[PDB]
Structures are given as structure tokens and as C-alpha cells.
Amino acid sequence: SCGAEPIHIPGAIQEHGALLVLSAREFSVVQASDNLANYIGVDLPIGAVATEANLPFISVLSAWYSGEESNFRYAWAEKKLDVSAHRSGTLVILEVEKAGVGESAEKLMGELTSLAKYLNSAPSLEDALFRTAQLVSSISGHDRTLIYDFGLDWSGHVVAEAGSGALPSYLGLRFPAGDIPPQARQLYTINRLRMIPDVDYKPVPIRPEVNAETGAVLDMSFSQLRSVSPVHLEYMRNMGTAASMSVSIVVNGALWGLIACHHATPHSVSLAVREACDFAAQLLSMRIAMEQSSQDASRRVELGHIQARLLKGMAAAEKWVDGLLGGEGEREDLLKQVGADGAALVLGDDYELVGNTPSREQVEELILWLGEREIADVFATDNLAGNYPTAAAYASVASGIIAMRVSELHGSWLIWFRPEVIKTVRWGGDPHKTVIHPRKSFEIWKEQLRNTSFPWSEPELAAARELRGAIIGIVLRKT
Amino acid sequence: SCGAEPIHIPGAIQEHGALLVLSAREFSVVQASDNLANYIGVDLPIGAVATEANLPFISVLSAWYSGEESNFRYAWAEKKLDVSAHRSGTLVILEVEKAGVGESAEKLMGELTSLAKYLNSAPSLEDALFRTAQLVSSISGHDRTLIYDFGLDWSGHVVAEAGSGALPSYLGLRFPAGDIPPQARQLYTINRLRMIPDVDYKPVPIRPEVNAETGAVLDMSFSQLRSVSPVHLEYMRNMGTAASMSVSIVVNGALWGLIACHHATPHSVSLAVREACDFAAQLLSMRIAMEQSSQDASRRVELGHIQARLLKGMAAAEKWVDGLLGGEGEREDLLKQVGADGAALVLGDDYELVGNTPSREQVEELILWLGEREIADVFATDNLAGNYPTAAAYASVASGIIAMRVSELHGSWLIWFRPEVIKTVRWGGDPHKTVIHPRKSFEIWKEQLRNTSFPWSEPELAAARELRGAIIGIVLRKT
Ligand SMILES: CCC1=C(C)C2=CC3=N/C(=C\c4[nH]c(/C=C5\NC(=O)C(C)=C5CC)c(C)c4CCC(=O)O)C(CCC(=O)O)=C3CCN2C1=O
Ligand SMILES: CCC1=C(C)C2=CC3=N/C(=C\c4[nH]c(/C=C5\NC(=O)C(C)=C5CC)c(C)c4CCC(=O)O)C(CCC(=O)O)=C3CCN2C1=O
Ligand SMILES: [Ca+2]
Ligand SMILES: [Ca+2]
Numbered sequence: 023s024c025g026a027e028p029i030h031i032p033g034a035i036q037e038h039g040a041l042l043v044l045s046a047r048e049f050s051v052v053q054a055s056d057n058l059a060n061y062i063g064v065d066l067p068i069g070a071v072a073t074e075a076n077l078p079f080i081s082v083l084s085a086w087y088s089g090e091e092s093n094f095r096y097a098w099a100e101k102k103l104d105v106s107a108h109r110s111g112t113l114v115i116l117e118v119e120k121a122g123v124g125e126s127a128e129k130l131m132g133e134l135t136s137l138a139k140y141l142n143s144a145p146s147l148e149d150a151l152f153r154t155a156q157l158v159s160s161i162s163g164h165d166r167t168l169i170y171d172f173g174l175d176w177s178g179h180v181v182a183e184a185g186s187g188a189l190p191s192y193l194g195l196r197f198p199a200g201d202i203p204p205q206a207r208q209l210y211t212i213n214r215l216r217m218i219p220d221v222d223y224k225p226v227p228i229r230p231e232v233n234a235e236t237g238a239v240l241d242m243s244f245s246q247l248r249s250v251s252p253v254h255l256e257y258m259r260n261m262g263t264a265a266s267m268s269v270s271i272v273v274n275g276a277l278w279g280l281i282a283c284h285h286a287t288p289h290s291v292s293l294a295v296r297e298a299c300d301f302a303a304q305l306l307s308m309r310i311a312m313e314q315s316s317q318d319a320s321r322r323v324e325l326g327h328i329q330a331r332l333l334k335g336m337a338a339a340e341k342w343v344d345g346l347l348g349g350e351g352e353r354e355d356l357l358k359q360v361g362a363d364g365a366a367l368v369l370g371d372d373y374e375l376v377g378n379t380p381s382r383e384q385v386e387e388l389i390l391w392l393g394e395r396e397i398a399d400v401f402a403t404d405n406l407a408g409n410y411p412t413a414a415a416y417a418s419v420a421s422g423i424i425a426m427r428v429s430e431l432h433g434s435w436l437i438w439f440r441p442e443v444i445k446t447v448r449w450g451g452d453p454h455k456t457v458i459h460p461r462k463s464f465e466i467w468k469e470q471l472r473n474t475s476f477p478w479s480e481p482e483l484a485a486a487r488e489l490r491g492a493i494i495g496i497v498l499r500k501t
Numbered sequence: 502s503c504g505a506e507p508i509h510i511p512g513a514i515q516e517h518g519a520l521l522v523l524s525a526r527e528f529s530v531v532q533a534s535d536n537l538a539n540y541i542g543v544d545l546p547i548g549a550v551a552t553e554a555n556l557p558f559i560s561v562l563s564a565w566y567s568g569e570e571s572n573f574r575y576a577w578a579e580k581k582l583d584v585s586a587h588r589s590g591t592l593v594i595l596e597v598e599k600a601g602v603g604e605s606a607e608k609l610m611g612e613l614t615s616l617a618k619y620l621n622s623a624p625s626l627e628d629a630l631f632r633t634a635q636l637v638s639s640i641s642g643h644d645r646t647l648i649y650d651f652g653l654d655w656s657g658h659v660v661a662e663a664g665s666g667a668l669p670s671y672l673g674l675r676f677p678a679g680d681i682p683p684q685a686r687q688l689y690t691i692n693r694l695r696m697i698p699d700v701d702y703k704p705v706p707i708r709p710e711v712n713a714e715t716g717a718v719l720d721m722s723f724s725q726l727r728s729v730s731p732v733h734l735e736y737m738r739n740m741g742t743a744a745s746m747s748v749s750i751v752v753n754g755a756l757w758g759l760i761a762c763h764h765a766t767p768h769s770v771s772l773a774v775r776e777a778c779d780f781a782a783q784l785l786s787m788r789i790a791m792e793q794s795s796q797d798a799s800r801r802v803e804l805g806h807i808q809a810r811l812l813k814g815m816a817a818a819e820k821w822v823d824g825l826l827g828g829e830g831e832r833e834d835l836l837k838q839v840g841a842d843g844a845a846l847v848l849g850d851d852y853e854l855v856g857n858t859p860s861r862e863q864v865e866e867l868i869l870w871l872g873e874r875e876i877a878d879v880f881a882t883d884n885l886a887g888n889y890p891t892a893a894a895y896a897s898v899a900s901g902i903i904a905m906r907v908s909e910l911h912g913s914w915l916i917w918f919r920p921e922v923i924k925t926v927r928w929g930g931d932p933h934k935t936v937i938h939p940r941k942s943f944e945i946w947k948e949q950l951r952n953t954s955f956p957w958s959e960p961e962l963a964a965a966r967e968l969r970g971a972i973i974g975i976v977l978r979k980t
Contacts, residue, residue, distance in 0.1 A: 127607040337974045
């Protein structure tokens with residue numbers, strides 16, 4: 023139900039600014055927020071053309087519209103206002119907000135240099151997360167400023183935090199995917215900054231509802247005043263947050279996480295600070311990408327060393343199998359190739375168990391089980407019990423596996439094993455709950471992670487797939 | 502001779518600031534530039550302790566000294582001065598410069614957002630070089646602002662340029678290594694920013710010459726006022742530049758290039774702008790690193806596809822050689838593995854020539870030549886004539902080679918070929934000249950690049966070394 027709600031066309035804004043829609047062609051007013059008259063101090067009804075009279079910035083706007091710069095910004099000093107417009111197809115969407123009480127742009131610039139210094143310093147990622155979380159908590163002045171890292175299921179967990187102490191510390195906690203639904207995650211991938219200064223605000227409509235130029239409702243994906251999904255506002259109430267301001271951390275065109283800010287009282291944030299909070303969220307995004315690409319390479323090369331040794335060992339050996347387990351050197355490498363505590367090489371009824379494997383009978387029952395599934399190339403799981411309950415009786419030694427068929431449906435198998443790792447995912451409220459209205463309970467929750475191994479990396483899987491290739495070629499050669 | 506000159510201990514500064522050295526222990530004056538009295542408006546002789554009287558910022562300095570932040574900055578409003586200190590072992594090195602006539606820090610911040618936008622946009626590297634070159638030429642206001650990219654010999658060439666037109670456009674030109682000597686390149690790796698506002702400045706000494714605390718001359722590696730090598734000042738004269746300001750572009754702890762600024766008249770630049778010019782030079786440094794790591798990976802994976810096909814073809818084939826050249830598919834792949842126009846597989850007197858190779862006799866004479874050299878693993882050159890003059894008579898088809906011995910000193914060879922590429926390295930003055938005093942002539946120069954191929958990439962060499970590994974293993978297996 024949640025996934026289906028269109029959050030980008032509320033036909034309404036928040037109370038803390040005004041909105042004016044006008045046509046590229048002649049800058050004629052097509053739509054407007056009802057409160058516009060309050061900020062602009064001018065009526066200009068639907069059909070009216072904007073002139074140097076009503077809008078003294080009309081000259082610099084017309085200029086910006088012909089240019090490439092994707093967003094407009096003007097300080098209406100005359101009226102103490104921060105103007106800002108963007109392009110939506112053939113439309114120009116003007117947003118007006120009260121300017122922030124003179125902040126040092128040098129101070130902003132400053133703390134945006136300590137990050138830029140600490141970032142290119144190339145220290146621990148955890149440090150960088152906190153050393154960004156902090157500067158944002160500094161320049162914003164919210165009661166709580168957490169960095170939030172999405173996992174692959176689209177749950178996330180808090181990996182850094184700053185805050186006065188006026189709001190509870192959520193550090194180290196999982197929240198479920200449904201808390202930031204798909205259409206929300208997507209919107210935040212392309213619009214990297216959002217603010218809700220008062221949660222109890224009264225939604226200001228846009229009239230007409232239907233833009234006369236396009237013929238549809240106004241698309242508000244890039245409207246920074248856009249009125250937020252009511253269902254989220256209840257969430258914020260249940261959490262005891264009057265204000266919030268989140269920034270998207272996008273790494274390689276995918277949403278990595280959020281810099282999320284919250285306040286116990288209502289809280290606003292100047293156009294400038296918002297623009298420095300995105301800068302910090304970008305600066306970090308660069309670091310993260312490099313940290314991730316450098317970690318992968320440095321693993322890929324590491325595993326590469328092992329595979330080059332095993333590849334040479336199998337070629338050099340007569341029976342070849344003793345290239346994989348001919349001595350302590352070969353056996354330890356087979357296990358290090360994928361970062362596994364044990365492995366089983368099965369050639370019909372010719373079983374070989376290296377390191378710490380389940381019993382010969384448990385592997386037999388497992389290979390028949392696999393055969394029943396449609397396993398092409400490799401099959402990898404860090405929780406075997408999920409699909410194979412029987413495995414729950416050797417989770418201690420084999421909670422995760424990487425399994426590969428070697429012979430064309432002739433019961434040949436190389437299977438790696440990884441023990442149970444007892445984790446306590448300390449959740450943030452009960453995740454499974456479905457009220458769907460959001461949950462009132464945010465009381466710290468705890469479930470034990472039973473019969474689940476430390477997870478397989480993409481390099482590990484890639485190293486395994488290459489070894490399959492290495493073997494198949496020789497097993498087809500010797501057959 | 503040039504390499505030997507110590508540029509980091511001139512015992513002197515430039516005219517446009519003052520310098521004060523004082524001891525960590527008690528902040529007692531140990532050294533001082535003779536002009537200090539002019540800026541500070543106080544004597545404080547050698548032995549004097551700094552107090553809230555002579556230095557009203559003494560309180561915030563003492564604070565900074567205990568902290569981690571590696572540099573100090575204070576606006577002496579009282580005296581219209583920009584103070585800045587750094588740590589040298591047990592010393593604190595204060596530099597004082599006149600503040601810049603009130604510049605918008607929001608304007609600076611601005612053009613440092615258009616770069617940050619255009620950078621994470623991930624467009625063409627050439628665009629990013631110009632779209633940084635420009636913003637620097639903007640915020641500095643020098644007559645010429647070139648980006649300079651070091652090659653592997655430590656020559657460089659101009660790859661972007663902005664400038665009013667008051668100074669000649671050097672775009673696309675090589676300058677020789679000796680123009681930025683080794684100790685200079687090294688210093689600029691660890692101190693990423695330098696300025697010379699007037700070239701004809703009168704060097705202000707530091708007394709005493711010998712710091713009484715350390716017992717040596719003052720080390721001025723991180724002094725932004727440090728007096729520059731006279732031999733460089735003559736260079737600037739011969740070039741017709743009264744001012745300059747260069748920023749180091751450091752990619753992965755190595756000096757990638759310089760953002761260089763020059764002025765026909767004397768030109769100064771505010772402490773702030775300098776700090777934004779480094780930010781731009783950093784922002785870019787991040788882009789470059791990613792561009793380079795993403796290009797490499799995307800080549801490594803590409804070549805990886807070919808090697809996986811050839812590896813499979815040799816394994817699948819009986820005589821195996823026809824895995825490398827059994828048909829158009831195998832032959833084209835052998836040549837695409839290294840990005841070569843031709844190759845020669847030589848197994849004793851069993852010659853095989855693919856694509857566009859020299860004559861069977863020219864390869865014979867080349868293999869004997871190689872045998873005379875000490876070639877372990879592979880030998881790669883993009884100019885064969887350099888070492889093998891005879892090759893100059895088949896440069897059209899083989900100006901560059903990658904050659905690998907396959908059989909243990911048993912005349913087995915896989916050699917790839919790359920044709921001559923007629924390039925005109927348009928130099929910037931005569932490079933070979935040695936006056937060593939610098940050259941007066943900066944008249945655009947031209948030498949033809951004869952008998953030299955498009956250069957081998959590290960991925961290409963890496964793909965070749967892996968194929969050697971693939972073959973040796975089978976040639977030792979079949980032998
Ligand atoms: C690390 C913990 C954490 C969480 C879990 C969290 C949640 C969060 N939800 C946000 C947005 C939305 N949630 C929802 C919906 C739900 N949230 C829920 O918890 C539930 C049950 C729903 C509906 C199924 C929607 C529609 C939206 C889009 C609002 C808009 O239209 O702008 C948003 C973005 C809006 C904001 O910045 O406050 C957040 C960010 C704040 N935040 C956190 O700091
Ligand atoms: C793209 C073209 C280009 C070049 C080739 C160039 C040269 C350049 N030389 C610089 C510095 C030095 N050259 C030299 C020495 C030489 N330069 C020469 O041309 C020659 C012949 C020498 C001595 C052998 C030295 C010692 C230094 C260190 C100065 C210091 O002590 O701070 C420096 C750094 C000083 C500066 O920023 O002006 C540069 C940068 C400026 N610049 C350019 O824009
Ligand atoms: Ca993640
Ligand atoms: Ca280069």
C-alpha cells in the first residue's frame with residue numbers, strides 16, 4: 023500500500039515559504055501557493071506576466087533560464103527573502119523562503135575545509151562518518167545528526183551520531199526498509215536534500231490544482247517546500263521530533279545512506295547551510311567511493327595471489343586434485359581463496375574434507391538437496407537453514423556456503439563452509455509489526471542472529487567463479 | 502647542479518609579509534624576519550616572550566598549539582593583517598600578511614560549488630581541467646591560469662588554460678623536467694600551494710641565521726613567504742611574468758600536475774582565495790583518481806574477457822597454438838589482448854605471423870637481439886629504434902613491441918607489434934639547451950616523433966604477463 027502513494031504531487035507546500043509556477047515562453051503565472059501574497063506582497067493572479075515591477079529579479083531570472091546552471095538563487099534584500107527556481111520541462115518553479123539571520127559564509131566555508139582536509143587525509147571510514155556527522159550537527163544545530171547506511175535489503179543502521187543529548191542516541195540500530203519506502207528512496211536518489219522545519223505545519227495548497235500549461239498536477243520532485251506524506255509526519259510525532267533535515271549520500275548513482283538531522287523543538291536552516299550540508303554529503307560520497315574501490319581492488323589482488331598459486335599447483339600435479347589439497351600449503355590456500363573455515367571436494371563418491379566441514383553424511387544429504395535446486399555456476403548463502411532446515415544441526419561449522427558443480431550433472435562438487443556467527447542485530451523498535459499506520463514503540467529491540475555466517479563478498483564469489491572456470495576446463499580435458 | 506640546490510632553507514622571505522619563529526615551551530622569540538617591526542609594529546627582540554600585549558591573539562594561538570589542526574589562522578582586524586602559523590618540530594612559525602580588501606566569502610564559496618557540481622557530474626576529464634582552470638582564473642584574476650600534467654619522464658604539457666589574453670597561450674606544449682627540478686617537485690608534493698606576487702622583490706633575511714633552539718638554519722618547507730630560488734626568478738623574467746601562484750594537484754600521494762597562474766604585472770591573492778584554489782585543486786584530485794581507477798578497471802575487465810576466451814581456446818584445442826591462431830576469432834583476440842596491430846608466435850623455427858608483422862627475417866634478427874639482452878618475464882618499448890637502430894627500417898609496422906620468452910632459453914617467443922605513430926610534440930622553447938642558467942627563448946618549438954608507437958598501458962602489460970603465465974604452464978605440461 024505504502025509503495026503506491028505518490029509523494030511527489032501533493033498539490034501543496036509547507037508554511038515556511040511560497041511557490042510560484044510560470045511558463046518558459048513569456049513568464050506568465052500558471053500556478054501559485056495560496057500564501058504567495060504574504061511573501062511576495064503582490065497579488066499577480068493566474069494569467070499575469072512577471073515584470074521588473076512585481077519581481078525585480080526578473081532580469082537575472084530570464085538570464086539564468088537561457089543558461090545551463092540547473093538551479094537559480096537570488097537574495098531579495100528589499101524583502102529579506104531567499105528566492106530559488108528550477109526547470110520542470112517547459113516550466114520554472116520559483117520557491118521563496120525568509121533569509122537566515124546573517125550567518126558567516128566564512129564559518130560555513132571553514133567547517134567545510136576541516137571535512138575536505140580530514141576526507142583527503144584518507145583515514146578510517148568510521149572516523150569520516152563521525153567527522154561529517156559532527157560538522158553537520160555544528161552548522162545545522164539540530165538536537166541529533168545521525169549518518170544512516172542502507173543494507174542490501176534496504177533496512178539501514180546508524181553508523182555515526184552527534185547530538186546535544188536532547189534526543190535519544192540511536193547509534194548501532196537497524197530500522198526496517200518500510201520506514202523509507204521505495205518511491206521515497208528513489209526521489210532521494212535524484213533530489214539529495216529535504217527539510218521539515220515544523221511537523222504540525224498546515225498544508226498550503228497550489229491553485230489551480232491542474233497546471234493549465236501542462237494539463238497535469240504540478241510535479242514537485244525538485245520542490246524543496248513540497249508538503250511531505252502525512253504517514254511520515256505521524257512517524258516523526260511517535261518519535262518526538264518537531265523538525266528534521268536529511269541529505270542523501272549517493273555513491274555511484276545509488277543511494278548509499280542519509281545524513282539525517284532531528285530537533286525536539288521546531289528548527290529551520292538557511293539556504294546556504296543546506297547548500298554546505300549537501301557539499302559535506304558529496305565530499306564524503308567521494309571518499310566512500312574510493313574507500314570501497316580501493317578495498318575491493320586490495321582484496322581482488324590478494325585473492326588473485328592465491329588463485330595464481332592454486333592454478334599453478336593443479337597444472338603442475340599429475341592427479342591435479344593435490345594441487346588443491348596435496349599438503350598444508352595447498353589446503354590452506356583452497357580455504358583462503360574464498361575466506362572459508364572448511365571445504366568439501368566431492369568427485370562422485372570420492373569425498374575430500376579440508377579444515378572444518380560437516381560430516382561426510384551431512385554433505386551427501388546437502389549435495390542431493392542442491393541437485394534438486396537449479397544451481398548454474400555457483401550458489402552462495404550466509405544462512406543455509408533459511409532454505410535447508412536440516413542444516414540447523416551443523417550451523418556451528420556451516421551456516422554459510424559457496425557451492426559449485428564441476429562435472430556436467432555427474433555429481434562433482436567443490437563446496438566451501440563458514441561457521442555460525444552469533445550476532446545481536448539491536449533493532450530500533452519491533453520491525454515485523456504492521457499497524458499500514460507506523461509504530462508508536464521505538465523501544466530498543468533485540469533478536470539473536472542464529473545459524474547465520476559472516477557474509478560473502480563480491481571478490482570472494484568472483485574468485486570462486488574463476489576457480490570453477492579453471493577446474494571445469496581441466497575436468498573436461500581429463501574426461 | 503640544479504638538483505643539489507637547497508630551496509627550503511634560503512634564510513630569507515619575500516617583501517609581502519613578516520615571519521616570527523618562537524619555541525613551543527614558553528613562546529619565546531628565537532628568530533624573526535628583519536621587516537617584522539614594520540607589520541607587528543613592535544620590536545620584541547630575540548629572547549623576548551610573546552604576551553597578550555605584543556600579540557593579542559596569543560590566547561587563541563596557545564589553544565591551537567595544543568590541538569590537532571595542523572595550521573593556525575587569525576584575522577588581526579586591529580592592524581588589518583592575516584596571521585597564520587604552522588608547527589616545525591618544537592617550533593611555531595608565524596607568517597603575517599596584509600588582509601585582502603573585503604572579498605565575498607559567499608562568492609568564493611559559490612564558484613567552489615560550480616566545480617563541486619561539475620566534478621561529481623563525472624563529465625570528460627578535459628572539461629573538468631578547463632572547468633577548474635577557469636574558476637581559478639576567476640577567483641585569482643591572474644592574466645594566465647594553465648593546468649600542467651606531468652608525464653613519466655617529469656616533462657609536462659599544458660592540458661587546460663584560461664587568461665584575459667595579456668600573456669601568450671601555451672596550451673598543448675611540452676616543457677622539460679629541468680624546469681621544475683626534483684627537490685622542487687618533492688617540496689610541492691608536501692606543500693601544495695606557492696605564490697610569488699612580485700618577481701623583483703628584495704629578499705628579507707631571518708636573524709639570527711642559526712635558530713638558537715634547534716642549532717640549524719630554519720627549515721622553511723611549509724613557509725608560504727619563503728624566498729624562492731633566484732634561478733627560477735630569472736626564468737620568470739625571461740617569460741615576462743611579474744607574478745605567479747601555483748597549486749599542486751596531488752593524486753594518490755604523487756604530484757599529478759600544477760594549477761599554475763601568471764600575471765604580466767605584479768599580483769597578490771588573499772589568504773582565503775589561496776585556500777579555495779587548494780580546495781579546487783583537491784576537488785579535481787578526487788575526480789582524477791576516480792576517472793583513472795574507473796578507466797583502468799573498465800580496461801582490465803575488457804581485456805579479461807579476451808584472455809578468458811583465449812585461455813579456454815588453448816585448453817580446448819589439441820595442438821593448443823590454434824587456440825591463439827586457429828581462425829579469425831582466435832587471431833583477432835590474440836591482437837586485441839594487448840591492443841596490437843600484429844604478433845609473431847615463434848617456436849624454434851616454427852614461425853607464425855598474425856595481422857601486420859615485420860618480415861620473417863626481421864623477426865629472426867630481432868629474437869637473436871632480444872636473446873643478447875637479459876629479458877626476464879617481458880620486455881616492452883614504444884620506440885624500438887632507441888636500442889635497436891636496425892628496427893628503423895620497419896618502424897611503419899613495428900615501432901612498439903611487447904616480447905615474451907615462453908620456453909626456458911629454448912628460442913620460444915610471443916611478440917606483439919605496434920606501428921609508427923607520426924606525432925609532433927610541439928615543445929615550449931628548445932628543451933635540450935643547457936645554459937645551468939635558464940633559457941631566454943620560449944619561442945614555440947617542433948620535433949617530429951619518428952619511429953615511435955602509441956604507448957603500452959599497465960593493463961595491457963598485465964594482460965600479456967598473465968598470458969605468459971597461461972602458456973609457460975602448458976608448454977612445461979606438453980614438454
Ligand atoms: C535512521 C532513522 C531514520 C529513519 C528510519 C528515518 C525515516 C525517514 N522516513 C522518511 C520519509 C518517509 N517515510 C515515509 C513512509 C513511512 N515511513 C514509515 O516509517 C512508514 C511506516 C511509512 C509508510 C509505510 C514516507 C512516505 C516518507 C517520504 C516523506 C516525503 O514524502 O517527503 C524520511 C525522510 C524525511 C526526513 O528527512 O525527515 C526519513 C528520514 C528520517 N529517518 C531517520 O533518521
Ligand atoms: C607549465 C609551465 C610552467 C613551468 C615550466 C613552470 C615552471 C616552474 N618552475 C618552478 C619552480 C622552480 N624552478 C626552479 C629551477 C629551474 N627552473 C628552470 O626553468 C630552470 C632551468 C631551473 C634550474 C635548473 C626552481 C629551483 C624552482 C623552485 C622555486 C622555489 O624555490 O620555490 C615553478 C614553481 C614556482 C611558481 O609557482 O612560480 C614553476 C611553476 C610555473 N611554471 C609553469 O607554469
Ligand atoms: Ca551499505
Ligand atoms: Ca600525467
